[PDB]
Design a protein around this ligand. Structure first.
Ligand SMILES: *[C@@H]1O[C@H](CO)[C@@H](O[C@@H]2O[C@H](CO)[C@@H](O[C@@H]3O[C@H](CO)[C@@H](O)[C@H](O)[C@@H]3O)[C@H](O)[C@H]2NC(C)=O)[C@H](O)[C@H]1NC(C)=O
Ligand SMILES: *[C@@H]1O[C@H](CO)[C@@H](O[C@@H]2O[C@H](CO)[C@@H](O[C@@H]3O[C@H](CO)[C@@H](O)[C@H](O)[C@@H]3O)[C@H](O)[C@H]2NC(C)=O)[C@H](O)[C@H]1NC(C)=O
Ligand SMILES: *[C@@H]1O[C@H](CO)[C@@H](O[C@@H]2O[C@H](CO)[C@@H](O[C@@H]3O[C@H](CO)[C@@H](O)[C@H](O)[C@@H]3O)[C@H](O)[C@H]2NC(C)=O)[C@H](O)[C@H]1NC(C)=O
Ligand SMILES: *[C@@H]1O[C@H](CO)[C@@H](O[C@@H]2O[C@H](CO)[C@@H](O[C@@H]3O[C@H](CO)[C@@H](O)[C@H](O)[C@@H]3O)[C@H](O)[C@H]2NC(C)=O)[C@H](O)[C@H]1NC(C)=O
Ligand SMILES: *[C@@H]1O[C@H](CO)[C@@H](O[C@@H]2O[C@H](CO)[C@@H](O[C@@H]3O[C@H](CO)[C@@H](O)[C@H](O)[C@@H]3O)[C@H](O)[C@H]2NC(C)=O)[C@H](O)[C@H]1NC(C)=O
Ligand SMILES: *[C@@H]1O[C@H](CO)[C@@H](O[C@@H]2O[C@H](CO)[C@@H](O)[C@H](O)[C@H]2NC(C)=O)[C@H](O)[C@H]1NC(C)=O
Lengths: 223, 159, 55, 53, 106
C-alpha cells in the first residue's frame, strides 16, 4: 500500500516552534488534499489544518488560527506543518491524514471513485516542557506466578518494552504512562506465568528508549 | 447429430451365417430384420470366436450401433449359436464395454418371447474399433456420420 | 438551458452573470457535492462487491 | 504439467512429484497424457470431481 | 481392514481385464476372477471380462478402476479369487474448498 515517513517529533520548549513533515509514496500525492489532526495524550481528537491538492485553499483550526501554517511540495511528495507559541495544551500526537472532505480539495480526476482513498499516519509526538531529557532506570520485580520490570525516570514518552529479544507475546501487560507532580515518567511491564516455570525457563526484559539513546536489559527472578 | 447418413463397411464375418431374419420383422411380404443390423448365427453347428477389427482413417467421428440377442429359451440359444452363452466385448483405444446375454423367457411381443439389447459406440479419428464375441451378437453393418449440428427433435401430433 | 458551459472546471453546476461591472462565472459547490456523493455511493455498491464460488 | 489428476492419483511413474501434495486449484494441461499401463474409469468425472473437492 | 480414525477414507482399487485366456492362466492359475469389495453400508462386485483390446503401448489388456469410501467405525472387506489390482493404503478426503480447472495458461 502507501508508505510514508514522518519527521519532526520531539520536545519543544514552551513558546517555541515545531516543524513536522510527512513524506509519502505509493500513490498520487498531486491529487489528494491532506489534513493535520492532533490528539492530546489521554483522550480527545482535535483537528488542526487542511490543504488542497495545489495549495489554493488552506484552512486552519480556530484553536491555532493566526499562529500556525501548513505547506506542501508536490515535486518532493512532502506535506509539512509549522506552529509557534506552543503551550501545554498543544503537546500531542500529530497525524498527517487524508480524510473524507469536500470534493474541491481533491483533484478533478479523483472526485468520483468507488474506493475513496484514505489513510492515517502514525502519530508524531511533540511535548512541551523544560527539556531535561534523561535516561531511564530499570528494576526487575518478582516474588500461578507473576513477574515484571519497572522503568522510571524518563521524560520523553516513546518508551518500548520487549522480552528476551522479543519472543513472549502472551500475557504481556504494558502499562499506560503515569505523570506525577514531578516531570518524570514511570511505566511497568508485567507477565503472569503459572508457578511451574522458575527452573523450567528464566526470562529477561528489555527497555528501549529511543530519544535518549537507551537500550537497557535486565534479568527477572526472585531474591 | 441431425442425420442418418449411413455407410456400409465390409467386416470379416468369416465362418458364420450372416443376414438372419425373423417372422416378426416383415419387409415386402417376406421375413426380414433391421436393415442396419446383421444377425449373426452359427454355421455348420460351430460358432468360431469372432475377433474383427475395423479402423477409422477419416476426419470425423463414427457412430457404431450394435446389439446382443437375449433368447427366450436355452435350446433356442443352442439352435442359433451351437454353444451355451455368449460374451460380447466392443473396445477401442479409449473405451470398452462387455455385454452378457441373459437367457430367459420374456412376455411375448408379436409372438416373440426373446429380446435384443442395443448399444452404441463412438470411434474417434485414428481410433480402431474392435469386436470380440462368441455368439448372441447382432453385428453392425456400417457407420453413421455424426456432426456438431444444430438439429433437434420434438414429440408432437401437430400436422 | 440551450447548452452547457465548457469553461467550468471547478464544479458541475454554476452561475454566469453580466452586470454593468463586468461578466463573470462561478460554480455552485454543495449541489456538485450532493451529486458526487450519490454517484460515489452507487459505485461503492457496484464495484468490489464480488462473492466467492469455488467448486 | 504432464499429468491429469487421475494419473497423479494412481501414481503414474512420471506423476511422482505430486505424491502427498495438497492444492486449492489443479490446472489440467491439454498436453497431458498417460505413459503407463492402460485403464479406464467407470464414472471418471465423478471420481475426478470428488478428488478435486 | 478396519477404520478406527475420525475421518472418512478413500480406497482406490481395480480389476485387470487381460487380452487373452492363457494370459489369465499365466497370471492367476484359474479361469475367471470375481472381486467383491464390501462395507457395512456398501458393496460392489466386479467381474473380469477377458478379451483382446486394441493395443495401447503394445498392451492388448486393460484395468478398470473403482473407488470405495469407508466411514469412521466402518470395516473395509476385500474378497477375491484373481484379477485383483489391490490397494496399498488410503487417502485422506476432506470437506475442502479446492477444485480443478483445465487450462493451458502459464
Ligand atoms: C413361462 O410362462 C409364460 C406365461 O405363463 C409363457 O409364455 C406363454 O407361452 C404360451 C405357449 O406358447 C403362449 O401361448 C400361445 O399364445 C398365442 C397367442 O396368439 C397362440 O398363437 C399360441 O398357439 C399359444 O397358445 C402365450 O402367449 C405365452 N404368454 C406370454 C405372456 O408370453 C412362457 O413360454 C413360459 N416360458 C417357458 C420357458 O416355458
Ligand atoms: C475373444 O476373441 C478371441 C479371438 O479368437 C477368442 O480367443 C479364442 O477363443 C476360443 C474359444 O473361446 C479358442 O478356441 C479354443 O482354443 C483352445 C486352445 O487350446 C483349443 O484347445 C480349443 O479346442 C478351442 O479351439 C481360441 O484358441 C482362442 N484364440 C486365441 C487367439 O486366444 C476369445 O474366446 C474371445 N472371447 C470373447 C469373450 O469373445
Ligand atoms: C513434459 O512432457 C514434455 C514432452 O513429453 C517433456 O519435454 C521433453 O523434454 C526433454 C528434456 O528433458 C526432451 O529430451 C530431449 O532429449 C534428446 C536426446 O534424447 C535431445 O536431443 C533433445 O534436445 C531433448 O533434450 C524431450 O524431447 C521432450 N519431449 C518431447 C516429446 O519432445 C517435459 O520435459 C515434461 N516435463 C516434465 C516435468 O516431466
Ligand atoms: C484380434 O485382432 C487384433 C487386430 O486384428 C489383434 O491385435 C493385433 O495383434 C498383432 C499381433 O501381435 C499386432 O501386431 C504387432 O504390431 C506391433 C506394432 O509395433 C509389432 O511390434 C509386432 O511385431 C506385431 O506386428 C497388432 O499391433 C495388433 N493390433 C491391435 C490394434 O491391437 C489381436 O491380437 C487379436 N486377438 C487375438 C486373441 O488374436
Ligand atoms: C470369498 O472369500 C472366501 C474366503 O476364502 C472364498 O471361500 C473360499 O473359496 C475357495 C474356493 O473358491 C474354497 O476352497 C475350496 O473349498 C472346498 C470346500 O470343500 C474344497 O473342497 C476345495 O478343494 C477348495 O479348497 C474355500 O474353502 C472357501 N473358504 C470358505 C471359508 O468358504 C470365496 O471363494 C471367495 N469368493 C469370491 C467371489 O471371491
Ligand atoms: C447380406 O445382406 C446384405 C444386404 O442385405 C448383402 O449385401 C450386398 O452385397 C453385395 C456384394 O456381395 C452388394 O453388391 C450389394 O449392394 C449389397 N446389398 C446391400 C443392400 O447393401 C450381403 O451380400 C448379404 N450377405 C450374405 C452372406 O447373404
Amino acid at each position: 500500500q502507501v508508505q510514508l515517513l514522518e519527521s519532526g517529533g520531539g520536545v519543544v520548549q514552551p513558546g517555541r516552534s515545531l516543524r513536522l513533515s510527512c513524506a509519502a509514496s505509493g500513490f498520487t500525492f498531486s491529487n489528494y488534499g491532506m489534513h493535520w489532526v492532533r490528539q492530546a495524550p489521554g483522550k480527545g481528537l482535535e483537528w488542526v489544518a487542511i490543504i488542497s491538492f495545489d495549495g489554493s485553499k488552506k484552512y486552519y483550526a480556530n484553536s491555532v488560527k493566526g499562529r500556525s501554517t501548513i505547506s506542501r511540495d508536490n515535486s518532493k511528495n512532502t506535506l509539512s506543518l509549522q506552529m509557534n507559541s506552543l503551550g501545554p495544551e498543544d503537546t500531542a500526537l500529530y497525524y498527517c491524514a487524508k480524510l473524507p472532505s469536500p470534493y474541491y480539495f481533491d483533484s478533478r480526476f479523483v472526485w468520483v471513485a468507488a474506493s475513496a482513498f484514505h489513510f492515517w499516519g502514525q502519530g508524531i509526538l511533540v511535548t512541551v516542557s523544560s527539556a531535561s531529557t534523561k535516561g531511564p532506570s530499570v528494576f526487575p520485580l518478582a516474588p500461578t506466578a507473576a513477574l515484571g520490570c519497572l522503568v522510571k525516570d524518563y521524560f520523553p514518552e516513546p518508551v518500548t518494552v520487549s522480552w528476551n529479544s522479543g519472543a513472549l507475546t502472551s500475557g504481556v501487560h504494558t502499562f499506560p504512562a503515569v505523570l506525577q507532580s514531578s516531570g518524570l515518567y514511570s511505566l511497568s511491564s508485567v507477565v503472569t506465568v503459572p508457578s511451574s516455570s522458575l527452573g523450567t525457563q528464566t526470562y529477561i526484559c528489555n527497555v528501549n528508549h529511543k530519544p535518549s539513546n537507551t537500550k537497557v536489559d535486565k534479568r527477572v527472578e526472585p531474591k | 447429430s441431425g442425420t442418418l447418413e449411413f455407410n456400409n463397411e465390409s467386416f470379416n464375418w468369416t465362418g458364420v451365417t450372416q443376414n438372419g431374419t425373423s417372422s416378426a420383422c416383415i419387409r415386402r411380404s417376406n421375413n426380414s430384420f433391421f436393415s442396419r443390423l446383421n444377425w449373426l448365427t452359427h454355421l455348420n453347428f460351430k460358432y468360431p470366436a469372432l475377433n474383427v477389427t475395423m479402423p477409422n482413417n477419416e476426419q470425423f467421428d463414427k457412430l457404431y450401433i450394435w446389439g446382443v440377442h437375449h433368447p427366450g429359451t436355452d435350446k433356442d440359444q443352442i439352435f442359433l449359436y451351437a454353444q451355451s452363452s455368449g460374451r460380447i466385448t466392443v473396445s477401442t483405444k479409449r473405451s470398452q464395454q462387455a455385454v452378457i446375454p441373459n437367457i430367459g423367457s420374456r412376455p411375448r411381443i408379436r409372438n416373440i418371447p426373446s429380446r435384443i439389447s442395443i448399444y452404441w459406440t463412438i470411434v474417434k479419428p485414428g481410433d480402431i474399433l474392435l469386436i470380440n464375441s462368441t455368439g448372441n451378437l447382432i453385428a453392425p453393418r456400417g457407420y453413421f456420420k455424426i456432426r456438431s449440428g444444430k438439429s433437434s427433435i420434438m414429440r408432437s401430433d401437430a400436422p | 438551458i440551450e447548452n452547457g458551459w465548457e469553461g467550468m472546471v471547478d464544479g458541475w453546476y454554476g452561475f454566469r452573470h453580466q452586470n454593468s461591472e463586468g461578466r463573470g462565472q462561478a460554480a455552485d459547490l454543495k449541489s456538485t457535492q450532493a451529486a458526487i456523493d450519490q454517484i460515489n455511493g452507487k459505485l461503492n455498491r457496484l464495484i468490489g462487491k464480488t462473492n466467492e464460488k469455488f467448486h | 504439467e504432464n499429468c491429469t489428476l487421475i494419473d497423479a492419483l494412481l501414481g503414474d511413474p512420471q506423476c511422482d512429484g505430486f505424491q502427498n501434495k495438497k492444492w486449492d486449484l489443479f490446472v489440467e494441461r491439454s498436453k497431458a497424457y498417460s505413459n503407463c499401463y492402460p485403464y479406464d474409469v467407470p464414472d471418471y468425472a465423478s471420481l475426478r470431481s470428488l478428488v478435486a473437492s
